[PDB]
Short mmCIF file of C-alpha atoms and ligand atoms in Angstrom, two decimals:
data_model
loop_
_atom_site.label_atom_id
_atom_site.label_comp_id
_atom_site.label_asym_id
_atom_site.label_seq_id
_atom_site.Cartn_x
_atom_site.Cartn_y
_atom_site.Cartn_z
CA UNK A 1 0.00 0.00 0.00
CA UNK A 2 1.56 3.25 -1.15
CA UNK A 3 1.15 6.67 -2.74
CA UNK A 4 3.29 8.48 -5.27
CA UNK A 5 3.06 12.06 -6.46
CA UNK A 6 3.94 13.16 -9.99
CA UNK A 7 3.71 16.32 -12.12
CA UNK A 8 5.97 18.53 -10.03
CA UNK A 9 7.98 20.60 -12.51
CA UNK A 10 9.21 24.10 -13.41
CA UNK A 11 6.58 26.53 -14.76
CA UNK A 12 6.43 30.31 -15.09
CA UNK A 13 4.25 32.27 -12.63
CA UNK A 14 0.58 32.25 -13.61
CA UNK A 15 0.93 28.95 -15.48
CA UNK A 16 -1.70 26.46 -14.31
CA UNK A 17 -0.23 23.26 -12.87
CA UNK A 18 -1.76 19.83 -12.19
CA UNK A 19 -0.19 17.31 -9.80
CA UNK A 20 -1.25 13.69 -9.55
CA UNK A 21 -1.42 11.36 -6.58
CA UNK A 22 -1.32 7.75 -7.77
CA UNK A 23 -2.33 5.25 -5.11
CA UNK A 24 -1.90 1.50 -4.79
CA UNK A 25 -3.28 -1.13 -2.43
CA UNK A 26 -6.14 0.85 -0.87
CA UNK A 27 -9.51 2.11 -2.08
CA UNK A 28 -10.48 5.74 -2.66
CA UNK A 29 -14.05 4.63 -1.91
CA UNK A 30 -12.91 4.04 1.68
CA UNK A 31 -10.11 6.56 2.30
CA UNK A 32 -9.68 10.30 1.89
CA UNK A 33 -6.67 12.00 0.33
CA UNK A 34 -4.80 14.95 1.92
CA UNK A 35 -2.43 17.34 0.15
CA UNK A 36 0.42 18.95 2.12
CA UNK A 37 3.39 21.06 0.98
CA UNK A 38 6.77 22.22 2.27
CA UNK A 39 8.77 25.16 0.91
CA UNK A 40 12.58 24.73 0.81
CA UNK A 41 14.00 24.81 4.34
CA UNK A 42 10.53 25.48 5.79
CA UNK A 43 7.85 23.60 7.69
CA UNK A 44 4.86 21.49 6.67
CA UNK A 45 1.74 23.29 5.46
CA UNK A 46 -1.70 21.69 4.96
CA UNK A 47 -3.44 22.45 1.67
CA UNK A 48 -6.68 20.46 1.62
CA UNK A 49 -8.50 17.14 1.54
CA UNK A 50 -10.92 15.26 -0.70
CA UNK A 51 -13.31 12.78 0.93
CA UNK A 52 -14.68 9.49 -0.39
CA UNK A 53 -17.69 11.22 -1.95
CA UNK A 54 -15.40 13.69 -3.72
CA UNK A 55 -16.22 16.63 -1.46
CA UNK A 56 -13.27 18.99 -0.96
CA UNK A 57 -12.14 21.34 1.83
CA UNK A 58 -9.13 23.67 1.99
CA UNK A 59 -6.90 25.76 4.25
CA UNK A 60 -8.20 29.29 4.83
CA UNK A 61 -5.43 30.79 2.68
CA UNK A 62 -6.13 28.65 -0.42
CA UNK A 63 -8.92 31.00 -1.45
CA UNK A 64 -10.14 28.85 -4.33
CA UNK A 65 -6.66 28.71 -5.96
CA UNK A 66 -6.57 24.93 -5.48
CA UNK A 67 -8.91 22.13 -6.58
CA UNK A 68 -8.92 18.39 -5.99
CA UNK A 69 -10.50 15.64 -8.11
CA UNK A 70 -10.57 11.86 -8.21
CA UNK A 71 -9.89 11.01 -11.84
CA UNK A 72 -9.84 7.21 -11.57
CA UNK A 73 -9.97 4.47 -8.94
CA UNK A 74 -6.23 5.02 -8.37
CA UNK A 75 -5.58 8.71 -9.15
CA UNK A 76 -6.27 12.07 -7.52
CA UNK A 77 -5.34 15.42 -9.09
CA UNK A 78 -4.45 18.70 -7.41
CA UNK A 79 -5.07 21.60 -9.78
CA UNK A 80 -3.32 24.86 -8.90
CA UNK A 81 -3.87 28.39 -10.23
CA UNK A 82 -2.40 31.89 -9.78
CA UNK A 83 0.99 30.38 -8.92
CA UNK A 84 3.92 32.54 -7.80
CA UNK A 85 7.38 31.92 -6.26
CA UNK A 86 5.66 31.55 -2.89
CA UNK A 87 4.23 28.26 -4.15
CA UNK A 88 7.62 26.71 -4.87
CA UNK A 89 7.67 23.64 -2.64
CA UNK A 90 7.63 19.90 -2.41
CA UNK A 91 4.02 18.65 -2.54
CA UNK A 92 2.88 15.50 -0.70
CA UNK A 93 -0.29 13.44 -0.85
CA UNK A 94 -1.34 11.25 2.06
CA UNK A 95 -3.98 8.64 2.83
CA UNK A 96 -6.60 10.08 5.15
CA UNK A 97 -8.45 7.84 7.58
CA UNK A 98 -10.66 10.88 8.29
CA UNK A 99 -10.56 14.71 7.84
CA UNK A 100 -7.59 14.91 10.23
CA UNK A 101 -4.19 15.06 8.48
CA UNK A 102 -2.94 12.40 10.90
CA UNK A 103 -1.71 9.40 8.96
CA UNK A 104 1.17 6.98 8.53
CA UNK A 105 1.02 6.71 4.75
CA UNK A 106 2.59 9.43 2.63
CA UNK A 107 4.04 9.75 -0.83
CA UNK A 108 7.74 10.69 -1.32
CA UNK A 109 6.76 14.08 -2.71
CA UNK A 110 7.01 15.87 -6.05
CA UNK A 111 8.91 19.13 -6.42
CA UNK A 112 7.28 22.26 -7.86
CA UNK A 113 9.23 25.32 -9.00
CA UNK A 114 7.62 28.61 -9.95
CA UNK A 115 10.19 30.65 -11.85
CA UNK A 116 10.88 32.19 -15.24
CA UNK A 117 14.42 30.75 -15.32
CA UNK A 118 15.13 28.01 -17.86
CA UNK A 119 16.03 24.35 -17.26
CA UNK A 120 19.76 23.51 -17.27
CA UNK A 121 21.47 20.15 -16.75
CA UNK A 122 24.57 19.81 -14.53
CA UNK A 123 28.15 18.89 -15.27
CA UNK A 124 29.59 16.18 -13.04
CA UNK A 125 33.22 16.55 -11.93
CA UNK A 126 35.39 14.22 -9.82
CA UNK A 127 36.49 15.08 -6.28
CA UNK A 128 39.68 13.00 -6.31
CA UNK A 129 42.67 12.76 -3.94
CA UNK A 130 46.16 13.26 -5.40
CA UNK A 131 47.22 9.88 -4.08
CA UNK A 132 45.81 6.68 -2.64
CA UNK A 133 48.01 7.43 0.37
CA UNK A 134 47.30 11.12 0.91
CA UNK A 135 45.18 10.48 4.05
CA UNK A 136 46.34 7.16 5.51
CA UNK A 137 44.12 4.09 5.64
CA UNK A 138 40.96 5.94 4.60
CA UNK A 139 40.35 7.97 1.44
CA UNK A 140 37.59 10.46 0.55
CA UNK A 141 36.14 10.42 -2.97
CA UNK A 142 33.37 12.55 -4.37
CA UNK A 143 31.34 14.08 -7.18
CA UNK A 144 30.68 17.79 -7.71
CA UNK A 145 27.32 18.20 -9.49
CA UNK A 146 27.57 21.73 -10.80
CA UNK A 147 25.33 24.31 -12.49
CA UNK A 148 21.79 22.96 -12.74
CA UNK A 149 18.23 24.27 -12.54
CA UNK A 150 15.65 23.57 -11.19
CA UNK A 151 15.96 21.22 -8.24
CA UNK A 152 16.19 18.27 -7.61
CA UNK A 153 19.25 16.14 -8.35
CA UNK A 154 19.72 12.74 -6.82
CA UNK A 155 23.01 10.96 -6.21
CA UNK A 156 23.79 7.40 -5.26
CA UNK A 157 27.00 5.36 -5.17
CA UNK A 158 27.65 2.07 -6.96
CA UNK A 159 24.04 1.81 -8.15
CA UNK A 160 22.80 1.93 -4.57
CA UNK A 161 25.10 -0.84 -3.26
CA UNK A 162 27.22 1.61 -1.28
CA UNK A 163 25.48 3.67 1.41
CA UNK A 164 27.79 3.57 4.43
CA UNK A 165 30.11 6.54 4.68
CA UNK A 166 28.15 8.47 2.04
CA UNK A 167 27.40 12.14 2.62
CA UNK A 168 25.30 13.88 0.00
CA UNK A 169 25.14 17.60 0.77
CA UNK A 170 22.19 19.98 0.44
CA UNK A 171 22.24 21.92 -2.82
CA UNK A 172 23.58 25.47 -2.68
CA UNK A 173 22.25 28.21 -4.90
CA UNK A 174 25.15 29.98 -6.53
CA UNK A 175 25.18 33.69 -7.31
CA UNK A 176 24.81 32.67 -10.98
CA UNK A 177 21.31 31.46 -10.15
CA UNK A 178 22.23 27.81 -10.75
CA UNK A 179 22.48 25.10 -8.12
CA UNK A 180 25.47 23.02 -7.20
CA UNK A 181 25.63 19.90 -5.06
CA UNK A 182 28.46 17.69 -3.78
CA UNK A 183 28.35 14.04 -2.71
CA UNK A 184 31.27 12.29 -0.97
CA UNK A 185 32.12 8.85 0.45
CA UNK A 186 34.97 7.56 2.59
CA UNK A 187 36.53 4.27 1.52
CA UNK A 188 39.52 2.00 2.34
CA UNK A 189 42.80 3.27 0.85
CA UNK A 190 44.34 -0.17 0.50
CA UNK A 191 42.24 -1.25 -2.48
CA UNK A 192 41.82 1.99 -4.44
CA UNK A 193 43.83 0.44 -7.26
CA UNK A 194 41.15 -2.15 -8.04
CA UNK A 195 37.82 -1.20 -6.35
CA UNK A 196 35.48 0.98 -8.45
CA UNK A 197 33.52 3.86 -6.94
CA UNK A 198 30.87 5.43 -9.15
CA UNK A 199 28.49 8.25 -8.32
CA UNK A 200 25.15 7.84 -10.09
CA UNK A 201 23.80 11.32 -10.81
CA UNK A 202 20.31 12.12 -12.11
CA UNK A 203 18.77 15.49 -13.02
CA UNK A 204 15.38 14.38 -14.36
CA UNK A 205 14.22 17.86 -15.40
CA UNK A 206 16.98 17.99 -18.06
CA UNK A 207 17.04 14.22 -18.75
CA UNK A 208 20.64 14.23 -17.51
CA UNK A 209 21.93 10.84 -16.33
CA UNK A 210 25.64 10.51 -15.54
CA UNK A 211 27.78 7.82 -13.90
CA UNK A 212 31.17 9.09 -12.85
CA UNK A 213 33.96 6.79 -11.68
CA UNK A 214 36.19 8.57 -9.17
CA UNK A 215 39.73 7.55 -8.22
CA UNK A 216 43.02 9.21 -7.15
CA UNK A 217 44.73 11.19 -9.91
CA UNK A 218 47.90 9.67 -11.37
CA UNK A 219 51.20 11.57 -11.28
CA UNK B 1 -6.72 33.03 11.98
CA UNK B 2 -5.98 30.35 14.59
CA UNK B 3 -2.37 29.83 15.70
CA UNK B 4 -0.50 26.66 16.59
CA UNK B 5 2.64 27.58 18.52
CA UNK B 6 5.32 24.93 18.92
CA UNK B 7 8.19 25.38 21.42
CA UNK B 8 11.13 25.19 21.67
CA UNK B 9 12.26 25.60 18.07
CA UNK B 10 15.46 23.77 18.98
CA UNK B 11 16.73 21.53 21.77
CA UNK B 12 19.95 19.52 22.39
CA UNK B 13 20.12 16.46 24.65
CA UNK B 14 22.41 13.44 25.23
CA UNK B 15 21.80 9.79 24.33
CA UNK B 16 19.79 8.30 27.21
CA UNK B 17 18.33 11.70 28.01
CA UNK B 18 14.88 13.16 27.45
CA UNK B 19 13.25 16.13 25.69
CA UNK B 20 9.85 17.76 25.94
CA UNK B 21 8.24 19.45 22.95
CA UNK B 22 5.17 21.65 23.48
CA UNK B 23 2.30 22.75 21.23
CA UNK B 24 -0.21 25.42 22.17
CA UNK B 25 -3.33 26.06 20.10
CA UNK B 26 -5.18 29.39 20.19
CA UNK B 27 -8.40 27.38 19.95
CA UNK B 28 -9.27 23.89 21.26
CA UNK B 29 -8.59 21.12 18.76
CA UNK B 30 -11.45 18.96 17.53
CA UNK B 31 -12.88 16.75 20.28
CA UNK B 32 -10.23 18.20 22.62
CA UNK B 33 -7.77 15.48 21.54
CA UNK B 34 -7.29 15.56 17.74
CA UNK B 35 -3.58 16.38 17.86
CA UNK B 36 -0.87 14.34 16.12
CA UNK B 37 2.94 14.30 16.19
CA UNK B 38 5.30 13.71 13.26
CA UNK B 39 9.04 13.05 12.83
CA UNK B 40 10.81 14.23 9.65
CA UNK B 41 14.34 13.78 8.27
CA UNK B 42 15.93 15.34 5.15
CA UNK B 43 14.36 14.40 1.82
CA UNK B 44 11.64 12.24 3.39
CA UNK B 45 7.95 12.62 4.16
CA UNK B 46 7.01 12.92 7.84
CA UNK B 47 6.47 9.77 9.88
CA UNK B 48 3.52 9.55 12.25
CA UNK B 49 4.46 9.06 15.93
CA UNK B 50 1.34 9.99 17.84
CA UNK B 51 -2.34 10.60 17.03
CA UNK B 52 -5.38 11.59 19.14
CA UNK B 53 -2.94 13.31 21.54
CA UNK B 54 -1.61 10.10 23.14
CA UNK B 55 -2.11 7.04 20.91
CA UNK B 56 1.17 5.53 19.72
CA UNK B 57 1.32 5.00 15.95
CA UNK B 58 1.94 1.38 14.92
CA UNK B 59 5.69 0.84 14.65
CA UNK B 60 6.83 3.94 16.52
CA UNK B 61 8.92 2.97 19.59
CA UNK B 62 7.61 3.18 23.17
CA UNK B 63 9.93 6.06 24.08
CA UNK B 64 7.64 8.53 22.28
CA UNK B 65 4.78 9.59 24.55
CA UNK B 66 2.06 12.13 23.82
CA UNK B 67 -0.13 13.88 26.35
CA UNK B 68 -2.52 16.78 26.66
CA UNK B 69 -6.03 18.04 26.02
CA UNK B 70 -7.85 21.08 24.68
CA UNK B 71 -5.17 23.55 23.61
CA UNK B 72 -2.04 22.27 25.37
CA UNK B 73 -0.08 19.24 24.15
CA UNK B 74 3.31 17.63 24.82
CA UNK B 75 5.53 15.11 23.06
CA UNK B 76 8.10 13.58 25.43
CA UNK B 77 10.98 11.61 23.95
CA UNK B 78 12.81 9.62 26.60
CA UNK B 79 15.76 7.21 26.38
CA UNK B 80 17.08 9.25 23.45
CA UNK B 81 18.97 7.45 20.69
CA UNK B 82 21.04 8.76 17.81
CA UNK B 83 18.14 7.86 15.47
CA UNK B 84 15.96 10.49 17.17
CA UNK B 85 17.90 13.37 15.63
CA UNK B 86 15.16 14.90 13.45
CA UNK B 87 12.63 17.70 13.09
CA UNK B 88 9.33 17.18 14.92
CA UNK B 89 5.88 18.67 14.14
CA UNK B 90 2.52 18.73 15.83
CA UNK B 91 -0.64 18.71 13.69
CA UNK B 92 -4.00 19.85 15.02
CA UNK B 93 -7.40 19.14 13.49
CA UNK B 94 -10.17 21.68 14.08
CA UNK B 95 -13.89 22.24 13.76
CA UNK B 96 -14.58 23.55 10.27
CA UNK B 97 -12.37 20.92 8.57
CA UNK B 98 -9.07 22.70 9.19
CA UNK B 99 -5.63 21.18 9.81
CA UNK B 100 -2.70 23.24 11.11
CA UNK B 101 0.93 22.22 11.58
CA UNK B 102 3.11 23.61 14.34
CA UNK B 103 6.24 25.43 13.18
CA UNK B 104 8.53 22.52 14.04
CA UNK B 105 11.27 21.62 16.50
CA UNK B 106 14.78 20.43 15.71
CA UNK B 107 16.12 17.85 18.12
CA UNK B 108 19.90 17.50 18.33
CA UNK B 109 21.70 14.61 20.03
CA UNK B 110 24.41 16.06 22.26
CA UNK B 111 27.54 13.87 22.07
CA UNK B 112 31.23 14.18 22.99
CA UNK B 113 33.32 16.60 20.93
CA UNK B 114 34.84 14.92 17.87
CA UNK B 115 37.38 16.49 15.50
CA UNK B 116 36.73 16.59 11.75
CA UNK B 117 38.67 14.48 9.27
CA UNK B 118 39.69 16.99 6.60
CA UNK B 119 40.22 16.30 2.89
CA UNK B 120 41.07 18.68 0.03
CA UNK B 121 40.25 18.29 -3.67
CA UNK B 122 41.82 20.18 -6.57
CA UNK B 123 39.72 21.18 -9.58
CA UNK B 124 39.43 18.53 -12.30
CA UNK B 125 41.03 18.94 -15.72
CA UNK B 126 37.55 18.41 -17.16
CA UNK B 127 36.22 21.49 -15.35
CA UNK B 128 39.25 23.64 -16.23
CA UNK B 129 38.32 23.30 -19.93
CA UNK B 130 35.25 25.47 -19.35
CA UNK B 131 36.86 28.39 -17.54
CA UNK B 132 36.10 27.88 -13.86
CA UNK B 133 37.99 26.12 -11.09
CA UNK B 134 36.18 24.63 -8.09
CA UNK B 135 38.38 23.69 -5.10
CA UNK B 136 36.65 21.66 -2.39
CA UNK B 137 37.41 21.14 1.30
CA UNK B 138 35.55 18.35 3.13
CA UNK B 139 35.22 18.25 6.92
CA UNK B 140 33.95 14.78 7.77
CA UNK B 141 32.10 13.45 10.85
CA UNK B 142 32.60 16.12 13.53
CA UNK B 143 30.72 17.47 16.58
CA UNK B 144 29.55 20.10 17.43
CA UNK B 145 28.15 21.66 14.23
CA UNK B 146 30.18 24.87 14.36
CA UNK B 147 33.32 24.85 12.24
CA UNK B 148 35.36 27.46 10.38
CA UNK B 149 37.05 27.04 7.00
CA UNK B 150 39.66 29.53 5.79
CA UNK B 151 41.01 29.19 2.26
CA UNK B 152 44.48 30.41 1.38
CA UNK B 153 45.89 30.87 -2.12
CA UNK B 154 49.66 31.56 -2.12
CA UNK B 155 49.04 32.56 1.52
CA UNK B 156 46.43 35.18 0.72
CA UNK B 157 43.30 34.68 2.85
CA UNK B 158 40.22 34.23 0.65
CA UNK B 159 37.00 36.07 1.32
CA UNK B 160 33.66 36.14 -0.53
CA UNK B 161 34.38 33.34 -3.03
CA UNK B 162 33.40 30.30 -0.95
CA UNK B 163 30.08 28.63 -0.11
CA UNK B 164 29.41 25.92 2.51
CA UNK B 165 26.86 23.14 2.90
CA UNK B 166 26.20 20.98 6.01
CA UNK B 167 24.49 17.59 6.31
CA UNK B 168 21.73 16.84 8.85
CA UNK B 169 22.99 15.21 12.03
CA UNK B 170 23.98 11.58 11.35
CA UNK B 171 21.40 9.13 12.70
CA UNK B 172 24.08 6.64 13.77
CA UNK B 173 27.12 8.54 15.11
CA UNK B 174 25.44 11.94 15.75
CA UNK B 175 28.08 13.84 13.76
CA UNK B 176 27.91 16.52 11.05
CA UNK B 177 29.87 16.89 7.84
CA UNK B 178 30.55 20.06 5.91
CA UNK B 179 31.81 20.88 2.44
CA UNK B 180 33.34 24.18 1.44
CA UNK B 181 33.65 25.10 -2.21
CA UNK B 182 36.10 27.78 -3.33
CA UNK B 183 35.22 29.08 -6.79
CA UNK B 184 37.92 30.72 -8.92
CA UNK B 185 38.13 31.66 -12.57
CA UNK B 186 40.45 29.32 -14.47
CA UNK B 187 42.64 32.38 -15.11
CA UNK B 188 42.94 33.12 -11.39
CA UNK B 189 43.56 29.45 -10.56
CA UNK B 190 46.42 29.18 -13.03
CA UNK B 191 48.12 32.34 -11.71
CA UNK B 192 48.73 30.79 -8.27
CA UNK B 193 50.53 27.72 -6.91
CA UNK B 194 49.76 26.87 -3.30
CA UNK B 195 46.17 26.03 -2.31
CA UNK B 196 45.36 25.43 1.36
CA UNK B 197 42.30 24.66 3.48
CA UNK B 198 42.61 25.60 7.17
CA UNK B 199 40.01 24.24 9.58
CA UNK B 200 39.09 25.53 13.04
CA UNK B 201 37.01 23.30 15.31
CA UNK B 202 36.58 22.55 19.02
CA UNK B 203 37.93 19.03 18.57
CA UNK B 204 41.22 20.53 17.32
CA UNK B 205 43.68 22.21 19.70
CA UNK B 206 44.77 24.46 16.85
CA UNK B 207 43.65 24.85 13.25
CA UNK B 208 44.63 21.98 10.93
CA UNK B 209 45.82 22.57 7.37
CA UNK B 210 45.65 20.57 4.15
CA UNK B 211 47.29 21.90 1.01
CA UNK B 212 48.27 21.02 -2.55
CA UNK B 213 50.29 22.67 -5.32
CA UNK B 214 48.56 23.19 -8.66
CA UNK B 215 49.95 20.61 -11.10
CA UNK B 216 52.12 18.62 -8.67
CA UNK B 217 50.10 15.52 -7.67
C1 LIG C 1 -10.87 7.28 11.77
O1 LIG C 1 -11.68 7.54 10.61
C2 LIG C 1 -12.87 6.73 10.65
O2 LIG C 1 -13.85 7.30 11.54
C3 LIG C 1 -14.26 8.61 11.09
C4 LIG C 1 -15.24 9.21 12.11
O3 LIG C 1 -16.27 8.26 12.40
C5 LIG C 1 -14.95 8.49 9.73
O4 LIG C 1 -15.39 9.78 9.29
C6 LIG C 1 -13.96 7.92 8.72
O5 LIG C 1 -14.65 7.72 7.45
C7 LIG C 1 -13.87 8.18 6.31
O6 LIG C 1 -13.83 9.64 6.22
C8 LIG C 1 -15.15 10.19 6.01
C9 LIG C 1 -15.04 11.71 5.92
C10 LIG C 1 -15.76 9.68 4.71
O7 LIG C 1 -14.95 10.09 3.58
C11 LIG C 1 -15.85 8.16 4.78
O8 LIG C 1 -16.39 7.64 3.54
C12 LIG C 1 -14.45 7.60 5.02
O9 LIG C 1 -14.51 6.16 5.10
C13 LIG C 1 -13.45 6.58 9.24
N1 LIG C 1 -12.41 6.06 8.35
C14 LIG C 1 -12.53 4.85 7.79
C15 LIG C 1 -11.37 4.44 6.89
O10 LIG C 1 -13.50 4.12 7.97
#
């Protein structure tokens, strides 16, 4: 039993936007659906709810800018109008047992960006030590994911097989107006000659998919 | 119109310790008890801990306890573990079909001071082909969060051309990590030789330095 949001993307202000909550393993004839959002670095904010009969109710601030509809036995749309930069956020849907937004079943979220800037895909550069021996028995390796817009980018290591010792940093907005993000991992020095370490980078908004192998630079 | 005020915004406590998080509503919640508590970590949706003021959500551990009624509610986390480092929210339901989240509370696990492991990374030849040079300094697995990075280029202290990012507190060892990125034009990078990262932190009796020379392995 799960939910998954989709449709979060970059649009210019005033462009209408529709998000979709796709559900699996429970019935919309039995459960309600809540929508919640969260601006970058901010707290959770309730938007509204649709009940089993399709009746909808919203936060006082919505003011008719938002609408909810059940479009099939497994899908629920959130339609948004008069969008501005204030509406840039990650949007969640959640299974409602009742009208209370208290529930243990949430989607992962879909990210919405309201901006007139254009999409740009990142370059991916190695963060590599000069030597296998530069820092003793442990080495740090990394990937610099530079100059993209909008959010998000995801990074994993070795196709998800390597998670321990991984630190993927929050994106920083550069003065250029593009984001940059670094991801690093600490690994044993003693096998750097033969073990492969690859960062798997994805920037879905630009259809950018890059695997970068990182190792110490040769002299 | 109605306010949900969550306090404190931040609290620090040791493993084995306890914290109390408070929510005060300007108006009684629905049925006097429709108040829920959530835990949230970076990049994830919130996880339900408590609902109806005091009912433990299936699969949340016993050390989370909710209490209260009307307009005043408390979440008490006892026997703190590293995994409890997170942001916590209350959520009230109200007459008129209204839900309101509290502003949130960040819970930090207070642990012994630990020095950072520092690493430095020169710009890649790939990047240099497009006119910019990024130099990165990594400070790995330290506590507490505060740390200072000073870049030096041929012993000139850099100012205004670096940006930092910090991870959320680690759920296993309660440490932070930080990356600092020094951005130079390729032209500037190639006019200088010695690149150094100097790191100041409570776990270090004096600042530690890592350096490299451009084009010298
Ligand atoms: C805890 O939620 C359950 O009890 C409440 C109150 O009696 C009830 O309203 C819930 O019914 C659901 O929500 C209402 C608004 C309608 O949409 C109804 O069709 C829903 O089933 C009930 N939840 C469940 C899952 O039975």
